[PDB]
Write an enzyme that holds these catalytic residues in place. Structure first.
Site, PDB file in Angstrom:
ATOM      1  N   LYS A 127     109.295 -63.884  98.164  1.00  0.00           N
ATOM      2  CA  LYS A 127     108.836 -65.188  98.664  1.00  0.00           C
ATOM      3  C   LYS A 127     107.556 -65.669  97.984  1.00  0.00           C
ATOM      4  CE  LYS A 127     111.160 -65.784 103.143  1.00  0.00           C
ATOM      5  NZ  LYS A 127     110.972 -65.753 104.613  1.00  0.00           N
ATOM      6  N   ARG A 139     114.269 -57.906 106.046  1.00  0.00           N
ATOM      7  CA  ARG A 139     115.328 -58.695 105.409  1.00  0.00           C
ATOM      8  C   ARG A 139     114.986 -58.810 103.934  1.00  0.00           C
ATOM      9  NH1 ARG A 139     116.177 -64.040 103.849  1.00  0.00           N
ATOM     10  NH2 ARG A 139     118.284 -64.870 104.233  1.00  0.00           N
TER      11      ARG A 139
HETATM   12  N1  LIG Z   1     115.354 -64.578 110.058  1.00  0.00           N
HETATM   13  C1  LIG Z   1     115.006 -65.039 108.765  1.00  0.00           C
HETATM   14  N2  LIG Z   1     115.916 -65.723 108.041  1.00  0.00           N
HETATM   15  C2  LIG Z   1     115.483 -66.143 106.825  1.00  0.00           C
HETATM   16  N3  LIG Z   1     116.187 -66.860 105.878  1.00  0.00           N
HETATM   17  C3  LIG Z   1     115.355 -67.044 104.863  1.00  0.00           C
HETATM   18  S1  LIG Z   1     115.631 -67.857 103.321  1.00  0.00           S
HETATM   19  C4  LIG Z   1     114.621 -69.323 102.855  1.00  0.00           C
HETATM   20  C5  LIG Z   1     113.223 -69.201 102.295  1.00  0.00           C
HETATM   21  C6  LIG Z   1     112.233 -69.901 102.977  1.00  0.00           C
HETATM   22  C7  LIG Z   1     110.924 -69.884 102.586  1.00  0.00           C
HETATM   23  C8  LIG Z   1     110.597 -69.157 101.473  1.00  0.00           C
HETATM   24  C9  LIG Z   1     111.546 -68.464 100.758  1.00  0.00           C
HETATM   25  C10 LIG Z   1     112.860 -68.478 101.159  1.00  0.00           C
HETATM   26  F1  LIG Z   1     113.700 -67.754 100.379  1.00  0.00           F
HETATM   27  N4  LIG Z   1     114.159 -66.454 105.123  1.00  0.00           N
HETATM   28  C11 LIG Z   1     114.210 -65.881 106.373  1.00  0.00           C
HETATM   29  C12 LIG Z   1     113.328 -65.174 107.173  1.00  0.00           C
HETATM   30  O1  LIG Z   1     112.036 -64.866 106.844  1.00  0.00           O
HETATM   31  N5  LIG Z   1     113.742 -64.756 108.372  1.00  0.00           N
END
Ligand SMILES: Nc1nc2[nH]c(SCc3ccccc3F)nc2c(=O)[nH]1
Ligand SMILES: Nc1nc2[nH]c(SCc3ccccc3F)nc2c(=O)[nH]1
Lengths: 273, 264
Positions: free
Chosen positions: A212, A246
């Site tokens: 991220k 995750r």
């Molecule tokens: N529960 C949960 N589900 C998720 N799905 C995504 S992806 C989008 C995304 C958003 C922001 C930055 C990088 C990225 F790649 N991130 C999470 C998380 O931190 N927690």
């Protein structure tokens, strides 16, 4: 002794679990091969997602999301023993995912969409509540908090109550502070530094930092060069008692979690703070 | 706030430092090249060892150790600003290393060889005290007692407490269980108010836990480094400098956001 129950099996959260990311935003065959690699590397949950949740992301129709997600959830549930989480905000995807064997509803929107809360409650499945400021189109324009920890904590109080009042029992819930979802670099690290303080709810903590911006902006590198930072984030979270991590890079994360487990097992307190 | 002083410069221990391993056991050119790579990857200390410290590594004579170690220390001190740690137990090598610019005496034997204690004191340099003995009744308590004893032995020889660093000696007469006990409780060693140095990189405590060979231990090594650094460890001794430095920057960003500035 924390456990989740779904689809007639259980997930024992007495140690950290690695959740592999399966982005579906021939597709079905490749998705299943990827799931298989992640399972072989030690992932015990696969997170299937058919709508982009990235800053600026466009919406996906329910029919398109269904086509991307349901065949993948079904194929995995039929062939492997792994738990399956579904990264969706749509009541129909929630319903249909549960029918074909999904174990956890992992909604970045915390069931905010019309009918989502009722759909989730109807499935009886575990639900992860995630904090996001705003929505994916706006969230990263100008994130702002007086006190990001207090504001995320207050959000969790409010959303737990909302879920309980819809008939979803406390014991089905997970919390995720939502790294990168309406946070600048300093907000993200404040939440990571104080992650153990969210254990007062007595609920599983799920975190996702893999590759991220909180790593990229710190190190000034692209997504491909973020693995060491990602493992550092994972270890920091897991040392504070995070239950589900995750990630994109499952093998490396599992190995890091084995070291965390060996360390926490030697500790009297079983956590760091 | 903690700082060390050597050779006209200082080491600021308010954040963790990565120490890169340079084993020297045209060989001079290659050693300088490897030091250059580690420094460009963000190592701020280089650990130069002339007699290997592996479980049964061959002992060498004083003359051989001087021939291997001194030209390397000298070459690095002439070419770079980096601090130089010398892994030796011999008083002659301690003495001659200091004369050509070494900053830290890192003796796995904690100056137990005849004359080593005196030589170290004469240099005025910082000294790392490492625990080495596997059987323990309480491994933390045993290591803690050893530090108390060696600190006193050093002070009595005229080595100021402010020149000392403590290392619990991961993998040195310790089984898997003992190593993780010490890692879990590392923050408790801060009661001495001394710098903590750790070295877990690619060690058996990772290899045996994961069942992987020495070239497949990077992820576990990084996990150990992070676990130690989150507990306030000051110097992390590693093979894989780039990756460890990246992990340490995440640790620093986290600790900077925390009230305590460490985890326990
Ligand atoms: N529960 C949960 N589900 C998720 N799905 C995504 S992806 C989008 C995304 C958003 C922001 C930055 C990088 C990225 F790649 N991130 C999470 C998380 O931190 N927690
Ligand atoms: N201060 C300090 N110096 C050191 N030199 C070495 S190399 C030995 C070694 C290498 C490989 C396997 C087992 C081993 F024992 N390890 C340390 C350490 O942990 N601390």
């Amino acid at each position: 002794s924390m456990k989740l129950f779904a689809q007639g099996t259980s997930l024992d959260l007495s140690h950290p679990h690695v959740m592999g990311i399966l982005n579906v935003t021939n597709s079905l065959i490749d998705a299943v091969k990827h799931a298989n690699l992640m399972i072989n590397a030690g992932a015990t949950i696969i997170d299937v997602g058919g709508e982009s949740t990235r800053p600026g992301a466009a919406e996906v129709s329910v029919e398109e999301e269904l086509q991307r997600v349901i065949p993948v959830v079904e194929a995995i549930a039929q062939r492997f023993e792994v738990w399956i989480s579904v990264d969706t905000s749509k009541p129909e995807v929630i319903r249909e995912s549960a029918k074909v064997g999904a174990h956890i509803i992992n909604d970045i929107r915390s069931l905010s969409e019309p009918g989502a809360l009722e759909a989730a409650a109807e499935t009886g499945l575990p639900v992860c509540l995630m904090h996001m400021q705003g929505n994916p189109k706006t969230m990263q324009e100008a994130p702002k908090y007086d006190d990001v920890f207090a504001e995320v904590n207050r959000y969790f109080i409010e959303q737990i109550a909302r879920c309980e009042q819809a008939g979803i029992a406390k014991e089905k819930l997970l919390l995720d502070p939502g790294f990168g979802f309406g946070k600048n670099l300093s907000h993200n690290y404040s939440l990571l530094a104080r992650l153990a303080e969210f254990h007062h709810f007595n609920l599983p903590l799920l975190v996702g930092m893999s590759r991220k911006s909180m790593i990229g902006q710190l190190l000034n590198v692209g997504p491909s060069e973020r693995l060491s930072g990602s493992l550092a984030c994972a270890v920091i979270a897991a040392m504070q008692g995070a239950h589900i991590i995750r990630v994109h890079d499952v093998k490396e994360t599992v190995e890091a979690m084995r070291v965390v487990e060996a360390t926490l097992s030697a500790k009297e307190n079983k956590r760091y703070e």
